[PDB]
Inverse folding.
RNA sequence: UCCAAGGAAGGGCAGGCGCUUACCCAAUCCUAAUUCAGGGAGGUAGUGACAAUAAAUAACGAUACAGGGCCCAUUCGGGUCUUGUAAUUGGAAUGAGUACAAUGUAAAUACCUUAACGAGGAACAAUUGGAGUCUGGUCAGCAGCCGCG
């Protein structure tokens, strides 16, 4: 960020992670280019699934990790997460409190 | 960005603004419609012959549209194409679980400028508690759904409805606030039908029979990209099928001429203009002597260094002549290559909101692909190891699958709409939603992993030296399959050592651990049998 | 949404702890 | 089956025009007056190369080969290895899939085997440095031709590997109205089984020709000996001009037959390079059919291309007539306002996805 | 601005968004062609998490089989056993909401009152969370024998 708390960007590609508990499953990262800057930064998706949900080429919102940078656990080098794809606030789609738009 | 950009410039007053008044059929929508044209035409027209062209100024022309909730296909069809959805409500909807599913249809087709209008609340409520109910329904929609929406509250003043400031507030919101662009609708040329005429090539014995199609001449105005760009092109008519245009019409020494006049040889084009096979890549040159002598000097390259339409058809055939009616509105679609072609396609899916059933492979589905809708058997599969290893016959709450099926083939991977049909006497809407997502990817000639289980129970086990009481009955099968690698439900490897002349399930076979009596010796990788075609 | 919570709210939620603490601290102080 | 074509003319063109369009066509009357009527050996193996990368494609050929019904499938590709006949070099077979490279679902990793050069088809440096930097102007960022062995006729013995990594959905819009300025001229003189001094004989022939110019002359000597040289002795030379401002190239090529003068070969390819500069405006005349394919297949937008009247020949006109039989596309030409020369502007609307 | 082609007419003005305005001369005063009536004077209605007020979600009995019950020290161990599992089951009760009449009366609405309805757990449907050495599911990759997440 430019010192800010949030920023809006566009997904260009979707990467792959993996886990150890309770089994090995993909834990998902992406590459998101900043709209205001053009910088493409890695971002993590904290949830189960939601690789199904987000997309390529969608305009997303970004937030921090609450550790002043500083990648959380065994995720090497990601400093940001997505809270709102298309401004739809991921947790609403997480239960079924919202339905994804046309794109 | 550019596909919305091409739409704004040529469109002006003769392309109208799309107005779709969509709600329940039980309400008096017609009073609000004729009230709306009482605002448009001076004060005195209250008759419905829609759809029809109403001329109102040079700013915007406005054609008004209607459809009941009893028609099933146009409930889909008007949703993807409307610039304006006008929802009228009664004071008793909100947890009516069978007649409000169209909201999710407009969600999946994409939300235009949409409206909530409450008028029968006056007919239903008469106390101060309706002010809380209005805000509560506002907490339901659209303010829950989309930020920046307005809820319109109007009077029940049935026939005899106002010309006053309230219709200027509605038409204020319609005229001032404009739409938002859609991705793939603007990627296609699409035309709504306005005037429908039929010519029969005057009377002959060939003009009627069991199979005779006549000359349907249709008229209207264009939207989206310009449709005249190529004659004889393909087209889709919704509810009837795919066709091609008979004739397209629209009512709103030059070497470049010499190229595409095919009655003239190219040597005559060059010869009249100035003064063979591209399989040889090396271009033509002159002789070594002439090019050497001419290129003795290098001076010659020294600077080289530092809208209304009249559309003709010979369709439809005879059976839809009996399907003539006052026109329930039909828009024309557009077919494209790499979308007109067929293929096995894989789609990504999730489950409908307020949906209460499981979704099986064996129950066919209606599928809205753009301007198309196909009943198709939805075969599901899943991965668990970044590759296919299993398949599922139905859709639980546990996970949500990916669909693979032979349908039409579409490379650009459009968004997905899977609707399950109900009759017009079951719930209240024309369809009930099954699953929605995006077309995931394109994949033809693919084969599904269908694995099964062979049952063998162990009772007294050593690592390399073991017998099963009951897993088989033939020593010949085990003798053919002794080179294979047998497994166990916890993951213990093994192979068949030998059938050992016992067609009874007892046979020597090795494992890398002694098999647990709570475990079962199994076998996987089984027959992948064919796709359902429909 | 989870159908797990059945436990009391507010005053009855305040009611249960003081009954528990009356059982807990009496053996604790002894 | 419906779009009817005639003769064996533009055989690789008509197959690729049907493949990218997804349209069924028909080609009939192929060498019907000839003593050996129908398809040749390389034309049969051409469609064998088609079948190796596609899926859902249906090819129906008459028993004498004079009539071919082609119905295309999807472009899949992948990794494979093809054997080319002695009738045509591998540069005959690189040329059609360059059109098919960015639109593939999986990357092209294809090893060719056989003769690598002729007098009529394209050379390797004409592929590597003549046609591959041209598609780089359209966003083809990563493309690689890995020459493992060189193959000299009649015996060949060469291996080349195509590596394509950039996959796009449409090319970018052309914007070319000015004739570019050439900064420097380089080249590759190569040989098989013979002396490095014979390469220097080709070097001294062109430096006799091109010492008069005020640009740089830096020709790379490409000597090969061992198992990496093939089975036959021979030599060739490709001389490429450079526009280092944007990345425009102009090249000339020929190979050397046994007993010939390699100095005359160096003189000829130098003067053919000079002549092609005098005949071109933006692209070479053989770079031109590479470009015009990339015009139509792009997104729905208006582009511009500077062309020369010397580029306007019978090969060019039939090139425009083939696209209208497939895509119904008309090229719109406006002359330049310049009075120093007589060029005109090729304006072609890309198809996008319009039916 | 219009034009029947002659001429005629209005002053570059409000207001909205960008950051929905309805009713009455019953009051006070003023005027009156004045005991009549009017008042772009005046009076009433619409508008809502940046804040924020009061507090509703259950109360009290009942019996029967029943106890390896809890706390602290991650410990090595010690102390304290008045405790729950059952609609067993029973009568209370209030008002969220439904409604005559009256008051008020700018004509007039709300406000302040109240006959008549409204509980045995589907009730008359509250969370956002935090942990978890719990319970389940064939996977780097491996045999000679025992195992990994």
């Amino acid at each position: 960020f430019g010192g800010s708390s949030h920023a809006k960007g566009i997904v260009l590609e979707k990467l792959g992670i993996e886990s150890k508990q309770p089994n090995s499953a993909i834990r998902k990262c992406v590459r998101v280019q900043l709209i205001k800057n053009g910088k493409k930064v890695t971002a993590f998706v904290p949830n189960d699934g939601c690789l199904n949900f987000v997309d390529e080429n969608d305009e997303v919102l970004l937030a921090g990790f609450g550790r002043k940078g500083k990648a959380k656990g065994d995720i090497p080098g990601v400093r940001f997460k997505v809270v709102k794809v298309s401004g739809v606030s991921l947790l609403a789609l997480w239960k079924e409190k919202k339905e994804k738009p046309r794109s | 960005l550019h596909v919305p950009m091409v739409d704004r410039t040529p469109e002006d007053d003769p392309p109208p603004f799309i107005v779709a008044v969509v709600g329940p059929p039980g309400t008096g929508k017609t009073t609000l419609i004729r009230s709306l044209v009482r605002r448009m035409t001076k004060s005195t027209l209250n008759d419905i012959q829609g759809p029809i062209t109403v001329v109102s100024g040079k700013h915007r022309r406005l054609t008004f549209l209607e459809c009941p909730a009893d028609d099933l296909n146009a409930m889909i069809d008007i949703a993807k194409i409307a610039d304006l959805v006008l929802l009228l409500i009664d004071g008793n909807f909100g947890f009516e679980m069978e007649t409000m599913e169209f909201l999710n249809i407009a969600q999946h087709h994409g939300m235009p400028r949409v409206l909530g209008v409450a008028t029968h609340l006056d007919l239903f409520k008469s106390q101060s508690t309706l002010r809380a109910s209005k805000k509560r329904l506002k907490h339901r929609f659209w303010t829950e759904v989309y930020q920046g929406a307005k809820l319109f509250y109007l009077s029940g003043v049935i026939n005899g409805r106002y010309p006053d400031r309230e219709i200027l507030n509605l038409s204020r919101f319609i005229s001032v606030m404009k739409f938002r662009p859609l991705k793939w609708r603007n990627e296609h040329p699409y035309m709504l039908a306005d005037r429908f005429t039929d010519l029969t090539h005057p009377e002959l014995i060939e003009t009627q029979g069991l199979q005779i199609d006549r000359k349907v001449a249709i008229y209207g105005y264009l939207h989206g990209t310009p449709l005249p760009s190529a004659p004889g092109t393909r087209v889709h008519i919704a509810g009837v099928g795919d066709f091609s245009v008979a004739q397209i019409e629209k009512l709103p020494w030059n070497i470049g001429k010499l190229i595409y006049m095919d009655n003239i040889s190219p040597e005559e084009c060059i010869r009249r203009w100035r003064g063979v096979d591209l399989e040889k890549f090396v271009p033509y040159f002159d002789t070594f002597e002439k090019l050497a002598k001419k290129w003795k000097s290098v001076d010659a390259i020294k600077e080289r260094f530092l809208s209304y339409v009249r559309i003709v058809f010979e369709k439809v055939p005879m059976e839809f002549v009996k399907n003539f009616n006052p026109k329930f509105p039909i828009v024309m679609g557009g077919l494209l290559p790499t979308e007109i072609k067929f293929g096995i396609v894989k789609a990504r899916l999730r489950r409908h909101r307020w949906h209460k059933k499981i979704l099986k492979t064996n129950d066919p589905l209606v599928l809205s692909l753009g301007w198309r809708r196909f009943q198709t058997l939805p075969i599901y599969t899943t991965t668990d190891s970044r590759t296919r290893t299993r398949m599922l016959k139905y859709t639980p709450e546990h996970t949500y699958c990916n669909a693979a099926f032979y349908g039409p083939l579409c490379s650009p991977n459009t968004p997905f709409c899977g609707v399950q049909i109900v009759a017009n006497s079951d719930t209240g809407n024309g369809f009930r939603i099954a699953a929605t997502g995006i077309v995931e990817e394109i994949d033809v000639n693919i084969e599904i992993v269908k694995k099964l289980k062979l049952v063998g129970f162990p009772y007294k086990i050593f690592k390399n030296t073991a017998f099963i009481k009951d897993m088989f009955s033939s020593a010949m099968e085990v003798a053919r399959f002794e080179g294979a690698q047998i497994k166990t439900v916890s993951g213990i490897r093994g192979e068949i050592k030998r059938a050992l002349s016992k067609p009874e399930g007892h046979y020597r076979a090795a494992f890398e651990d002694k098999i647990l009596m709570s475990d079962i010796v199994i076998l996987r990788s089984w027959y992948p049998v064919r796709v359902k075609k429909f | 949404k989870t159908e797990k919570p059945k436990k009391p709210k507010g005053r009855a939620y305040k009611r249960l702890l003081y009954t528990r603490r009356f059982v807990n601290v009496t053996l604790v102080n002894g | 089956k419906y779009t009817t074509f005639q003769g064996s003319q533009n055989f690789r063109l008509r197959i690729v025009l049907a493949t990218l369009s997804g349209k069924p066509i028909k080609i009939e009357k192929i060498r019907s007056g000839d003593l050996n009527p129908g398809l040749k050996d390389y034309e049969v193996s051409f469609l064998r190369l088609i079948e190796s990368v596609t899926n859902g494609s249906v090819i129906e050929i008459s028993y004498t080969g004079t009539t071919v019904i082609y119905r295309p499938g999807i472009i899949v590709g992948g990794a494979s290895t093809h054997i080319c006949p002695s009738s045509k070099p591998v540069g005959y077979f690189v040329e059609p899939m360059l059109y098919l490279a960015p639109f593939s679902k999986k990357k092209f990793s294809i090893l060719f085997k056989g003769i690598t050069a002729s007098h009529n088809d394209a050379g390797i440096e004409a592929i590597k440095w003549g046609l591959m930097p041209v598609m780089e102007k359209f966003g083809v960022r990563e493309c690689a031709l890995h020459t493992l062995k060189r193959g000299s006729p009649p015996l060949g013995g060469g291996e080349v590997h195509l590596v394509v990594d950039s996959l796009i959905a449409q090319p970018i819009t052309m914007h070319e109205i000015d004739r570019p300025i050439i900064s420097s001229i380089t080249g590759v003189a190569y040989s098989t089984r013979v002396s490095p001094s014979l390469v220097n004989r080709m070097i001294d022939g062109a430096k006799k020709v091109l010492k008069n110019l005020q640009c740089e002359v830096n020709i790379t000597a490409d000597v090969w000996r061992g198992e990496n040289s093939g089975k036959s002795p021979g030599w060739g030379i490709t001389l490429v001009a450079q526009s280092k401002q944007k990345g425009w190239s102009y090249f000339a090529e020929d190979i050397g037959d046994a007993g010939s003068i390699p100095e005359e070969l160096g003189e000829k390819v130098a003067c053919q390079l000079l002549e092609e500069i005098s005949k071109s405006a933006a692209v070479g005349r053989n770079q031109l059919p590479l470009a015009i394919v990339y015009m139509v297949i792009g997104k729905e937008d208006i582009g511009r291309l500077r062309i020369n009247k010397e580029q306007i020949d019978e090969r060019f006109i039939i090139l425009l007539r083939d696209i209208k039989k497939i895509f119904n596309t008309e090229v719109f030409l406006k002359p330049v306002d310049e009075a120093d020369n007589e060029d005109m502007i090729a304006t072609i609307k890309g198809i996008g996805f319009t039916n």
In short: Residues 20-24 of chain A lie near RNA strand E (CB under 10 Å from a C1').
